[PDB]
Amino acid sequence: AKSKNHTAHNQTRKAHRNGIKKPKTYKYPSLKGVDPKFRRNHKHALHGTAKALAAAKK
């Protein structure tokens, strides 16, 4: 007793109800997936600049 195998009917109505929200883009994104060499240097550089700005205004 065969059946209805497949259909995409009504799926787009379902989606566009409350649908296709763009992903919330953020400042300062993930540094995962990024070259770890660059991650490491970026860490040390930020440590340096934080120290420098605090020493400029201590």
């Binding site: 409350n18 649908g19 296709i20 763009k22 992903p23 994104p29 997936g33």
Partner: protein, 159 residues
């Protein structure tokens, strides 16, 4: 059986081109890529490493990461009812820039030039683009340009 592979229904898509088989030219490699760069994606089937999926063929994305011979790209992808962020470690043979973004940057610096000139004279820049507005009146003459009366043509079989 049903066959759904990484390189399925891709024949004419990764068909290289006509009279452009063989290797790749060198600006593909001498070009530069930085974080925040927007890039197009067409795939070179002659380079079977670092390829994208056929979904990402002919698409557009942003860079997040850079390595020896490859580049990170972010894409948004419809999955059901949302756009998902998808990260690709692609090769520059498949990358190229977005001239739309290039022209946008040029428009930006020109807008800045206009703001500078209007700081110099206070002369009402009107920076924004505006559409092809509807056109204004005019007077067309007739000299050497008389109207030729036209009319339809009868039915000829033309065999």
């Amino acid at each position: 059986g049903k066959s759904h592979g990484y390189r399925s229904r891709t024949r004419y898509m990764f068909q290289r081109d006509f009279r452009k088989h063989g290797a790749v030219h060198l600006s593909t490699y001498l070009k530069v890529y930085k974080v925040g760069d927007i890039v197009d994606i067409k795939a070179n089937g002659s380079i079977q490493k670092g390829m994208p999926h056929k979904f990402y063929q002919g698409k557009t994305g942003v860079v997040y990461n850079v390595t020896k011979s490859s580049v990170g790209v972010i894409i948004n992808k419809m999955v059901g009812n949302r756009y998902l962020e998808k990260r690709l470690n692609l090769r520059v043979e498949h990358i190229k820039h977005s001239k739309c973004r290039q022209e946008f940057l040029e428009r930006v610096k020109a807008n800045a030039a206009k703001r500078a000139e209007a700081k110099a004279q206070g002369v009402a820049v009107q920076l924004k683009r505006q559409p092809a507005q509807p056109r204004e009146s005019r007077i067309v003459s007739t000299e050497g340009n008389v109207p030729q009366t036209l009319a339809p043509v009868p039915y000829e079989t033309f065999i």
